Amino acid sequence: TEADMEEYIWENSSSERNILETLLQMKAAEKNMEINKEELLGTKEIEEYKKSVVSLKNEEENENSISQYKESVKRLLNVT
Amino acid sequence: HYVDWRMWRDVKRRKMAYEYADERLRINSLRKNTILPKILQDVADEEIAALPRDSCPVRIRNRCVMTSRPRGVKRRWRLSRIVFRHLADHGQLSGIQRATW
Amino acid sequence: QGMAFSKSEGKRKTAKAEAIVYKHGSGRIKVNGIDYQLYFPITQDREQLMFPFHFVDRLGKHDVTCTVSGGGRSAQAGAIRLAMAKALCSFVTEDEVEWMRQAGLLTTDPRVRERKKPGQEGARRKFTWKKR
Amino acid sequence: SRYSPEFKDPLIDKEYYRKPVEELTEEEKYVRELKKTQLIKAAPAGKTSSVFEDPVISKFTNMMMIGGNKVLARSLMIQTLEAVKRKQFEKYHAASAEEQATIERNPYTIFHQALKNCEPMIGLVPILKGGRFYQVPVPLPDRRRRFLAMKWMITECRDKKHQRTLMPEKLSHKLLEAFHNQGPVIKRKHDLHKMAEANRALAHYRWW
Amino acid sequence: AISRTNENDPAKHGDQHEGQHYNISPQDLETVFPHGLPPRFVMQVKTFSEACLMVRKPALELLHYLKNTSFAYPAIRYLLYGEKGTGKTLSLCHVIHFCAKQDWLILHIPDAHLWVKNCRDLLQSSYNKQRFDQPLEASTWLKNFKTTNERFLNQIKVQEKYVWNKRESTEKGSPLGEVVEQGITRVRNATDAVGIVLKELKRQSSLGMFHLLVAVDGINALWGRTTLKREDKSPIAPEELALVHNLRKMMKNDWHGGAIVSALSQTGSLFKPRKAYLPQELLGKEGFDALDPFIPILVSNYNPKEFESCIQYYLENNWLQHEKAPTEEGKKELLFLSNANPSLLERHCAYL
Amino acid sequence: SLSEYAFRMSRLSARLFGEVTRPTNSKSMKVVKLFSELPLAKKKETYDWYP
Numbered sequence: 001t002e003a004d005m006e007e008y009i010w011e012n013s014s015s016e017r018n019i020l021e022t023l024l025q026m027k028a029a030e031k032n033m034e035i036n037k038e039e040l041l042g043t044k045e046i047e048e049y050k051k052s053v054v055s056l057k058n059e060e061e062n063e064n065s066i067s068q069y070k071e072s073v074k075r076l077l078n079v080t
Numbered sequence: 081h082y083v084d085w086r087m088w089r090d091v092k093r094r095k096m097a098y099e100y101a102d103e104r105l106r107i108n109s110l111r112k113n114t115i116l117p118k119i120l121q122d123v124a125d126e127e128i129a130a131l132p133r134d135s136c137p138v139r140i141r142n143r144c145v146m147t148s149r150p151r152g153v154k155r156r157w158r159l160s161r162i163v164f165r166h167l168a169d170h171g172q173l174s175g176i177q178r179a180t181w
Numbered sequence: 182q183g184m185a186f187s188k189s190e191g192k193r194k195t196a197k198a199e200a201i202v203y204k205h206g207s208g209r210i211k212v213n214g215i216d217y218q219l220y221f222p223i224t225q226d227r228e229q230l231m232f233p234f235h236f237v238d239r240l241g242k243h244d245v246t247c248t249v250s251g252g253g254r255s256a257q258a259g260a261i262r263l264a265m266a267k268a269l270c271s272f273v274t275e276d277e278v279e280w281m282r283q284a285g286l287l288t289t290d291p292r293v294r295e296r297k298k299p300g301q302e303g304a305r306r307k308f309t310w311k312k313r
Numbered sequence: 314s315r316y317s318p319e320f321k322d323p324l325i326d327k328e329y330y331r332k333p334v335e336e337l338t339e340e341e342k343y344v345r346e347l348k349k350t351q352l353i354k355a356a357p358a359g360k361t362s363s364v365f366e367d368p369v370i371s372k373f374t375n376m377m378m379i380g381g382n383k384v385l386a387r388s389l390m391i392q393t394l395e396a397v398k399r400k401q402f403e404k405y406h407a408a409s410a411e412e413q414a415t416i417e418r419n420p421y422t423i424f425h426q427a428l429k430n431c432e433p434m435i436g437l438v439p440i441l442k443g444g445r446f447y448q449v450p451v452p453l454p455d456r457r458r459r460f461l462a463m464k465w466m467i468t469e470c471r472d473k474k475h476q477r478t479l480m481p482e483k484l485s486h487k488l489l490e491a492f493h494n495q496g497p498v499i500k501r502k503h504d505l506h507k508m509a510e511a512n513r514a515l516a517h518y519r520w521w
Numbered sequence: 522a523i524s525r526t527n528e529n530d531p532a533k534h535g536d537q538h539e540g541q542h543y544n545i546s547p548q549d550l551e552t553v554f555p556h557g558l559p560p561r562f563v564m565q566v567k568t569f570s571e572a573c574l575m576v577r578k579p580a581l582e583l584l585h586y587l588k589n590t591s592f593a594y595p596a597i598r599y600l601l602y603g604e605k606g607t608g609k610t611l612s613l614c615h616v617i618h619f620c621a622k623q624d625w626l627i628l629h630i631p632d633a634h635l636w637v638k639n640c641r642d643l644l645q646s647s648y649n650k651q652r653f654d655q656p657l658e659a660s661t662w663l664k665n666f667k668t669t670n671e672r673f674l675n676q677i678k679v680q681e682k683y684v685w686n687k688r689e690s691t692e693k694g695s696p697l698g699e700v701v702e703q704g705i706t707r708v709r710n711a712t713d714a715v716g717i718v719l720k721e722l723k724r725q726s727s728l729g730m731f732h733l734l735v736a737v738d739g740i741n742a743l744w745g746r747t748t749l750k751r752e753d754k755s756p757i758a759p760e761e762l763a764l765v766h767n768l769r770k771m772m773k774n775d776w777h778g779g780a781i782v783s784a785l786s787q788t789g790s791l792f793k794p795r796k797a798y799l800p801q802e803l804l805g806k807e808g809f810d811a812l813d814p815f816i817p818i819l820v821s822n823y824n825p826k827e828f829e830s831c832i833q834y835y836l837e838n839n840w841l842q843h844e845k846a847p848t849e850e851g852k853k854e855l856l857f858l859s860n861a862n863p864s865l866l867e868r869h870c871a872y873l
Numbered sequence: 874s875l876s877e878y879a880f881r882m883s884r885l886s887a888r889l890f891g892e893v894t895r896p897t898n899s900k901s902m903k904v905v906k907l908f909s910e911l912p913l914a915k916k917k918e919t920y921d922w923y924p
């Protein structure tokens with residue numbers, strides 16, 4: 001199980017599931033019918049978000065990893 | 081030629097306990113578990129109780145090997161405090177000095 | 182990087198401190214890599230760290246990176262106070278160093294725990310005496 | 314003592330060291346040159362050069378300390394000073410402009426003057442004469458007068474009369490009473506004075 | 522008035538106001554903040570006879586985000602974090618004041634740690650028999666929730682029928698005030714009344730009836746451990762508490778029409794070291810997973826300008842009574858001993 | 874309080890390193906301790922205590 005894993009893998013994780021769901025709701029709010037899993041999870045922004053979450057989960061948490069995570073989430077949620 | 085009859089009784093106890101140690105260990109193992117049937121464990125209880133009393137290791141006493149003093153013995157040297165001090169105060173125990181600090 | 186610094190040692194009870202005092206700084210003290218107010222939550226301990234710099238009117242002018250081990254909370258603050266004062270002597274005038282010495286900021290405190298004696302309760306505390 | 318007799322006590326006064334050399338007297342100059350040749354003890358962990366350092370409050374805190382727990386003793390002291398300040402601010406806010414002028418809001422001023430009001434001017438010493446002990450009026454040294462005021466204040470606050478009242482509440486209330494020349498601690502001083510006046514004829518029993 | 526600003530509208534605060542104290546009116550203090558304010562800050566308001574809050578960058582950043590909130594998108598979770606006593610609670614309160622003045626419905630949990638410790642009457646829930654009700658904690662919150670949102674409690678009308686007892690039941694179409702009144706009046710039904718209030722507000726905010734702010738201080742409690750113990754002294758999990766189970770649901774971003782602003786706190790936390798302050802250190806794995814994705818907002822010690830304005834505000838109120846405190850030497854000692862930590866500075870100035 | 878994976882990995886490691894494989898309570902573990910050391914009566918300090 002994921003509890004047994006000693007290395008965090010972003011694939012099939014709660015992070016991937018939660019960000020996917022959030023992005024789908026955002027698309028529905030814009031009335032866009034592009035709901036393809038692959039496209040949504042293939043954007044560069046998702047790659048930055050995936051990298052940030054993996055660092056936080058696998059490496060020592062510090063103020064710089066939290067700031068990197070903040071900026072990645074702000075881009076995916078269109079918060080400026 | 082042991083110091084006294086008490087030391088001689090302890091010498092016999094240490095000898096008898098040595099002779100019976102394996103048998104006592106084997107029977108005791110049968111009793112010190114919850115795996116084997118209680119009927120078997122009850123028969124083992126009787127068998128270890130029927131062994132001679134002087135085979136029981138708890139009856140051994142660490143007496144001073146020089147004077148037979150049953151108390152005040154230092155286990156590392158097997159000597160009573162009085163005999164140890166006599167040898168130590170004369171400088172006859174390697175590396176042991178009076179402590180001041 | 183070419184920044185001037187001095188290093189000294191300090192001892193208090195069983196605590197031993199090593200302090201690096203930088204010639205120029207903002208007043209940041211790191212104790213074992215932790216901010217001093219987080220490392221020393223007790224106010225009295227933080228007052229001991231202020232005393233060397235306050236006495237020479239140099240609060241907010243140096244950075245300090247010190248490492249302390251052994252002893253308790255108060256001994257460690259005393260050991261750091263001594264290590265910082267000794268290292269800070271490199272960046273003050275000779276007259277100021279003498280004032281620091283006459284204020285008790287550069288002396289190793291020799292007061293250490295006395296041993297318990299046999300036949301007594303403590304180092305000095307005797308057993309209750311019974312006249313009859 | 315782990316210090317040899319040569320070791321001298323540290324002097325922790327920033328202003329003393331900064332004094333202009335010209336103002337120094339010939340004796341003062343000698344005292345400074347001599348100190349440069351003398352061993353000095355390490356400054357104790359209590360007193361520092363801080364401008365907020367108050368020696369009287371530090372001594373009062375130590376007298377409150379139990380079993381070396383200075384952190385708890387210091388916590389009680391600062392809570393008392395805050396409690397006094399908050400009570401005076403409330404009294405100040407509810408007072409009129411004329412009354413507001415006379416209300417003291419500095420807790421240190423209140424603490425110092427409350428203890429001064431509790432200091433006894435005369436004491437009593439038990440003197441054994443002809444097999445009978447007599448309480449003889451005697452002059453008290455300044456240190457003893459100040460110590461007695463602090464001990465009476467702390468003893469009063471520790472009395473069991475106060476039920477489930479925390480020390481900062483008790484001490485702040487008692488300090489404010491003494492600051493106004495009221496309360497049991499002031500009464501204890503008056504009783505000592507009255508007892509000494511009654512025994513004035515026994516003053517000759519003292520031989521110093 | 523160097524430390525003060527004349528702009529008392531939290532919607533008009535910008536970067537020009539950084540460091541300046543803005544006054545919260547006594548009416549807002551009673552209505553917006555019946556609860557939530559730090560214990561020691563409440564003492565200051567009583568002593569100074571005024572509530573003044575420093576405009577700082579953490580609140581300014583979060584106010585900027587909440588002014589540009591897309592109410593169509595799922596609610597965004599903002600997490601205020603920072604070291605002990607840097608001002609996370611009072612930054613959250615400044616934001617609650619903004620939304621409260623813009624006619625948002627406020628869901629202010631002042632301290633979630635109180636719900637997982639020191640519970641005298643832990644009753645088994647009737648709605649679900651595997652969960653525990655907390656009558657005293659629920660009723661306490663309901664009374665304050667009523668005070669803050671009294672204006673809206675008549676307009677919002679329940680959309681279901683809720684069976685309280687065999688005899689009593691709230692009917693569809695009645696105002697939500699009735700649910701709040703039942704929980705307050707009948708304290709055995711308080712936990713379920715809180716659940717219903719949360720269930721109704723989440724549903725009806727998505728429908729576009731009102732804007733909902735979910736302000737949870739001490740949010741790290743929800744996914745940690747409890748000191749509450751069963752009859753046999755076995756540990757109880759936070760999920761088993763019905764009151765916590767219902768608040769967790771408010772934290773998910775599966776609704777829209779509002780925002781979810783939370784603040785961490787190691788003070789009052791259970792089984793956390795003194796110096797733990799980072800999100801994953803306090804939230805844990807389960808806590809981080811529940812909030813991810815969220816926007817962390819750092820709260821730091823006072824900067825040099827902010828530190829000077831705080832001293833000036835204390836001096837203007839005559840709070841600093843020591844004769845050396847107004848001097849430059851005293852101010853340097855004040856800075857060193859606190860290291861510009863707002864909480865340490867307030868505590869040291871309280872007796873100076 | 875172990876996952877199946879963790880439980881089966883611990884049982885494999887215990888078999889590899891020669892430790893007890895079956896589930897054994899602390900009472901029955903005394904049998905292992907009894908046969909891993911010499912009885913006190915069999916130690917040279919005990920039976921050769923006296924010259």
Ligand SMILES: Nc1ncnc2c1ncn2[C@@H]1O[C@H](COP(=O)(O)OP(=O)(O)OP(=O)(O)O)[C@@H](O)[C@H]1O
Binds near residue numbers: 573787
């Ligand atoms: N914006 C502010 N305006 C005025 N005072 C403030 C402000 N922020 C902090 N303070 C001061 O600092 C104290 C601590 O603030 P607060 O309780 O918000 O901190 P916190 O970070 O939430 O603390 P904890 O980590 O214990 O939960 C306040 O009681 C107040 O005296």
Ligand SMILES: Nc1nc2c(ncn2[C@@H]2O[C@H](COP(=O)(O)OP(=O)(O)O)[C@@H](O)[C@H]2O)c(=O)[nH]1
Binds near residue numbers: 649682684713714717
């Ligand atoms: N007494 C009572 N409480 C209710 C009723 N419906 C909902 N609640 C409360 O409101 C909470 C939220 O409702 P719901 O989403 O149905 O909860 P769930 O069944 O635990 O998922 C519940 O956990 C209950 O505490 C009801 O009919 N009666």
Ligand SMILES: [Mg+2]
Binds near residue numbers: 138140141
């Ligand atoms: Mg024996």
Ligand SMILES: [Mg+2]
Binds near residue numbers: 303306
């Ligand atoms: Mg003792």
Ligand SMILES: [Mg+2]
Binds near residue numbers: 785
């Ligand atoms: Mg807080």
